[PDB]
Design a protein around this ligand. Structure first.
Ligand SMILES: Nc1ncnc2c1ncn2[C@@H]1O[C@H](COP(=O)(O)OP(=O)(O)OP(=O)(O)O)[C@@H](O)[C@H]1O
Ligand SMILES: [Zn+2]
Lengths: 278, 101, 94, 50, 52, 209, 50, 286
């Protein structure tokens, strides 16, 4: 047997060291190890994606230097906590980030090392705020070909993981592979202060600065009117026989809103004389 | 061994290798580099391998010989003339040359 | 020392404080532009000089206190009228 | 509709060239530059329009 | 007859030449609105026709 | 959330613009574009593109992974030196040509006069020639007439090396002719002089080389 | 000092070669039309201080 | 040196997680860990850093310890895996400095001749940007004391990187994109008028600190001087800006023209399709 719906908690410094690590080595696939804490069966957390030394000849299982395991992990023991590894990371920048033959070559070594040994797959050139590029797996064994595959006792959480059916090549690799749920969980010690960094360090930065303006007069008036004549052409062609005439398009775009933000923000900039000055 | 400035001595037989507009691109590079280093001295030995006169569309590679030759026929003249580009020519029998040249 | 700048400062002020004649305030202010302490325009259509930024002198304690007077005056007027403008713009937030 | 624009963010396709179809519901396609490929049909298409 | 914006001033001396030529803001806007009223006239027959 | 969807539209074209040309339109939200990678693609258009921009051909922008159509570009993709743009004339006076009333008056009727009085051609229906060919004994100022009319034109003037198009990349030539003719229709009642067209115009080929 | 020569040569190991391109033309202030020698055409931007 | 800094929030979270490493154990004073950094120009950058164990007893503020062996071994790891990176200084989480920090700084300026500290706050609510830069140099003194070695507030900012907010703006989920035209201007009004002039009132509170106190360095060097940079505008009563209201009318002129013409054309926008679609939906309802 019986198997509970699993879950991958993050600390998001995982994702930051994946974007920074795979951003640093961006023309090349990288290989690494993932640290965290084995909390229970149905959840497991990542709390540390840490740097792993480069291979030049082959990205493989030989990228794990055991003296860097003793020295790196031991100097993490004399860092604030000796926590337990939860798996391993890598990258695939060159394509749509599916499980290379190296990953199946070292997966049995990694699950000889660990219980879960969950993959971490990424293409570092995807997005700037949007995509969730990281990909996570579990190679279930071929010895369980007698029993039914991926039991997942309730399959309600898995049925709600089953929303995208993502990556049809990995779905070509549905033989003994399946994705897992990854939430982007909260860090109340970190989320609100990240909102302070983010929001208060971006809303005018110092929140005192701009409270440019006389050249957006001319730029804005040309940008407006040069679109306004082609906006006003079509009432030549507005007529009756509704289905017999076909050209429906709005002509009000960026002339309400851009002009409201334009003249209102720059007329409050005209109010910065009285607002700033007395 | 007298001026010793910029003697670009083209042997003009090892230009073509197999390709299409490769020798043309070499002509563009020689004329642009020649435009750059203002006191260039062009030399070309044995024009008759690449020069010719004309055919009646025989061997198909002689087409590329003709367009490669018309690289010279235009780009020696063009609309933008050359400055200080002294083209020194050598031959064995100058009867077989193109009257375009 | 004087209130604000008066925007236009006379040959009697420069010449009387300077204990000099009228026809040396010109060389005084141009020579001051050679020094570079001021960037003032030589307003002598009326012999009454316009002011710009200057290098200051030593802040006395009464300069601290009167500076706190007009400075706090500026502070709570821009802050108070600031809160008034925000109070007029208070109903349009949602 | 605007949330349904990841459909427009889906992977594009290839323009091919059908010489003729062969037996057992497969066709032959040469693409823009490449060789010939005996490739597979879908369900919502017509073998009668090969 | 000819011009260089040399406007007459009997008591200045410079005979001040000055202008502000780019004021195409109101130029292009007025030229649009003149056509716009013709477009509203082009809508008037649709409006008065569709009702009654 | 509509604004969030707006930025999700806007994010499609930031770092790359992978250039192709618009080839075919089936219908709404479906097209065929010949990329500048040499290969052709069944694609789909986005609702951002105004459908009149499709025309027959356009310098269009694509996507990296999905390779979806992103944008239709303005008229671009140079005519080599680009109509020469300023002053790059051979600087030959019109009376510099000595004693060719047949040639100067003839080509004056052929090109220089439809530059000016084309509407008066249109009322009669003379149908003036699109282009013209010059030939004969070489050395007689065949370049020089293009120098003088080039020096004394008002519209665009594009010199074209006839040996220009035979280059290394496989398929650049006809797109370069699209550059010349899209720019030709794009500028004005313009003038394009093409010299040494025998480099392209060969009557005999070999369809194996 | 041999470990210093292999130190500098050791530091240059992580560098990656770049691409030879050529500017076709400038599209806008941020958009740039180039064509690399190996093939197709692109529009990109400068870095910061180019 | 130093022009300013470029500091990504990633290394700030590299302070936060070690604050989680010490928040579970007995926190004596605060965190002091390494600040690695990417120093290229007179500007600065930081992509990464790491921490190091540290205690301090407050009796002579001189008994305090890092592990330089740990620092150079893990620095050998990080230098090995990234040749770009080197040390640039340190950091501390308690937002107020103290006297030992010059011994921390000058004790680690032996590796690189600058060692910039970073003030942060694990619970910030009042500050603007958390990041802060000093440099430990001398202006001797006017009296010329024996080496008044002084931290100098080099200006500081949050750095940025392409594709670093892939986590962040997906995580926070709360962002309202482009609030220009609605209430962002008055957020900045409340926080700059209030949160600017309250800082002005703490500077005038420091002026009262010079009144009743403040003879330490009464600071008649920079205060009235850059306060004379402020006193470019002596805005006394009667207000003396007769040469600014035709200026104000010139400023109001073009904008009110754009409101007149352009907003009349905004009426011309709404009216046409509003009437046509209005009576389409009205008398074509039945
Ligand atoms: N009628 C003329 N009056 C004055 N100069 C003339 C005249 N005809 C020819 N020339 C001179 O001779 C030159 C003729 O050569 P041009 O380059 O114009 O033709 P071309 O390039 O020789 O053509 P092709 O390469 O086919 O022989 C002119 O540039 C000019 O210097
Ligand atoms: Zn791999």
């Amino acid at each position: 047997a019986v198997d509970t719906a699993e879950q991958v908690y993050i600390s998001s410094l995982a994702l930051l060291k994946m974007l920074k690590h795979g951003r640093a080595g961006v023309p090349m696939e990288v290989m690494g190890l993932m640290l965290g804490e084995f909390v229970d069966d149905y959840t497991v957390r990542v709390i540390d994606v840490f740097a792993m030394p480069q291979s030049g000849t082959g990205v493989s299982v030989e990228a794990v230097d055991p003296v860097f395991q003793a020295k790196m992990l031991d100097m993490l023991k004399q860092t604030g906590r000796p926590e337990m590894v939860v798996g391993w990371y890598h990258s695939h920048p060159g394509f749509g980030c599916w499980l290379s033959g190296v990953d199946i070559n070292t997966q049995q070594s990694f699950e000889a090392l660990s219980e879960r040994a969950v993959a971490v797959v990424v293409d570092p050139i995807q997005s700037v705020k949007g995509k969730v590029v990281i990909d996570a797996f579990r190679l279930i064994n071929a010895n369980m070909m007698v029993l039914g595959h991926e039991p997942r006792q309730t399959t309600s959480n898995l049925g709600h993981l089953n929303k995208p059916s993502i990556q049809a090549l990995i779905h070509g690799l549905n033989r003994h592979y399946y994705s897992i749920t990854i939430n982007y969980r909260k860090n109340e010690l970190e989320q609100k202060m990240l909102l302070n960094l983010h929001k208060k360090s971006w809303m005018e930065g110092l929140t005192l600065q701009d409270y440019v303006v006389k050249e957006m007069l001319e730029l804005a008036k040309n940008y407006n009117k040069a679109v306004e004549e082609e906006d006003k052409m079509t009432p030549e062609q507005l007529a009756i026989k509704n289905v017999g005439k076909q050209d429906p398009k709005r002509h009000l775009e960026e002339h309400v809103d851009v002009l409201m933000t334009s003249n209102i923000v720059q007329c409050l900039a005209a109010m910065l004389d009285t607002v700033v000055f007395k | 061994s007298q001026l010793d400035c910029n003697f670009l001595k083209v042997v003009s037989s090892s230009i073509v290798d197999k390709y299409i507009g490769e020798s043309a691109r070499l002509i563009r590079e020689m004329f642009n580099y020649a435009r750059d280093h203002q006191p260039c001295i062009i030399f070309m030995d044995e024009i008759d391998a690449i020069g010719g006169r004309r055919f009646s569309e025989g061997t198909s590679a002689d087409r590329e010989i003709q367009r490669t030759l018309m690289e010279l026929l235009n780009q020696m003249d063009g609309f933008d003339t050359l400055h200080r580009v002294k083209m020194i020519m050598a031959t064995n029998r100058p009867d077989t040359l193109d009257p375009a040249l | 020392t004087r209130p604000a700048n008066h925007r236009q400062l006379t040959f009697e002020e420069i010449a009387k404080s300077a204990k000099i004649t009228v026809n040396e305030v010109e060389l005084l202010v141009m020579k001051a532009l050679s020094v570079g302490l001021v960037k003032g325009s030589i307003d002598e259509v009326d012999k009454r000089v316009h002011m710009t930024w200057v290098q200051p002198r030593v802040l006395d304690l009464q300069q601290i206190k009167g500076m706190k007077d007009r400075l706090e005056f500026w502070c709570t007027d821009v802050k108070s009228m600031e809160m008034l403008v925000e109070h007029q713009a208070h109903d349009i937030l949602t | 509709l605007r949330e349904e624009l990841q459909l427009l963010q889906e992977q594009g396709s290839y323009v091919g060239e059908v010489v003729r179809a062969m037996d057992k519901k497969k066709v032959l396609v040469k693409v823009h530059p490449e060789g010939k490929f005996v490739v597979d049909v879908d369900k919502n298409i017509d073998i009668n329009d090969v | 007859d000819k011009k260089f914006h040399g406007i007459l001033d009997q008591g200045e001396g410079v005979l001040i030449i000055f202008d502000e030529p780019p004021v195409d803001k109101t130029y292009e806007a007025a030229l649009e609105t003149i056509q716009n009223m013709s477009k509203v006239v082009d809508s008037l027959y649709n409006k008065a026709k569709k009702l009654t | 959330e509509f604004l969030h969807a707006q930025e999700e539209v806007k994010r499609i074209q930031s770092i790359p613009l992978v250039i192709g040309q618009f080839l075919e339109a089936v219908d709404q939200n479906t097209a065929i574009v010949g990329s500048t990678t040499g290969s052709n693609y069944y694609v789909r258009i986005l609702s951002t593109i105004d459908r009149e921009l499709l025309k027959p051909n356009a310098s269009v922008a694509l996507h990296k992974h999905s390779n979806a159509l992103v944008d239709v570009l303005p008229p671009e993709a140079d005519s080599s030196i680009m109509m020469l743009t300023s002053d790059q004339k051979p600087d030959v006076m019109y009376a510099d040509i000595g004693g060719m009333d047949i040639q100067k008056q003839e080509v004056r009727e052929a090109v220089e006069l439809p530059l000016t009085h084309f509407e008066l051609y249109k009322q009669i229906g003379i149908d003036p020639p699109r282009g013209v060919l010059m030939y004969g004994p070489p050395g007689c100022g065949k370049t020089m007439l293009a120098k003088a009319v080039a020096h004394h034109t008002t519209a665009a003037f594009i010199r074209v090396v006839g040996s220009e198009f035979v280059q290394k990349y496989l398929g650049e030539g006809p797109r370069m002719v699209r550059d010349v003719f899209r720019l030709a229709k794009e500028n004005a009642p313009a003038i394009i002089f093409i010299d040494e067209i025998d480099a392209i115009a060969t009557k005999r080929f070999d369809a194996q080389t | 000092k041999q470990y210093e020569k292999s130190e500098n040569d050791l530091k240059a190991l992580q560098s990656v070669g770049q691409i030879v391109g050529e500017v076709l033309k400038q599209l806008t202030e941020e958009k740039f039309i180039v064509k690399a020698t190996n093939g197709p055409r692109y529009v990109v931007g400068c870095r910061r201080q180019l | 040196a130093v022009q300013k800094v470029v500091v990504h929030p990633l290394v700030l979270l590299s302070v936060v997680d070690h604050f989680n490493r010490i928040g579970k154990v007995g926190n004596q004073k605060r965190v002091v860990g390494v600040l690695l950094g990417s120093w290229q120009k007179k500007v600065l950058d930081v992509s990464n850093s790491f921490a190091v164990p540290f205690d301090e007893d407050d009796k002579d503020d001189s008994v305090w310890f890092l592990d330089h062996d740990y620092l150079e071994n893990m620095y050998g790891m990080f230098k090995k895996v990234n040749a770009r990176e080197r040390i640039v200084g340190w950091y501390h989480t308690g937002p107020k400095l103290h006297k030992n920090d010059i011994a921390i700084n000058e004790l680690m300026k032996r590796y690189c001749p600058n060692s910039v500290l970073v003030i942060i706050d694990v619970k910030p609510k009042d500050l603007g940007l958390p990041t802060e830069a000093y440099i430990s140099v001398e202006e001797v003194h006017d009296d010329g004391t024996p080496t008044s070695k002084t931290f100098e507030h080099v200006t500081s900012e949050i750095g940025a990187e392409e594709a670093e907010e892939v986590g962040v703006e997906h995580l926070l989920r709360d962002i309202k994109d482009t609030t220009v035209g609605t209430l962002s201007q008055r957020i900045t009004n409340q926080v700059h008028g209030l949160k600017g002039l309250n800082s002005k009132l703490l500077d005038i509170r420091s002026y009262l600190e010079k009144v009743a106190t403040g003879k330490l360095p009464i600071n008649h060097q920079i205060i009235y001087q850059l306060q004379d940079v402020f006193n470019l505008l002596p805005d006394v009563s009667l207000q003396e800006f007769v040469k600014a209201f035709y200026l104000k009318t010139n400023d109001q002129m073009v904008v009110v023209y754009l409101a007149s013409l352009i907003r009349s054309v905004v009426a011309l926008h709404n009216l046409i399709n509003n009437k046509i679609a209005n009576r389409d939906a009205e008398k074509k309802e039945g």
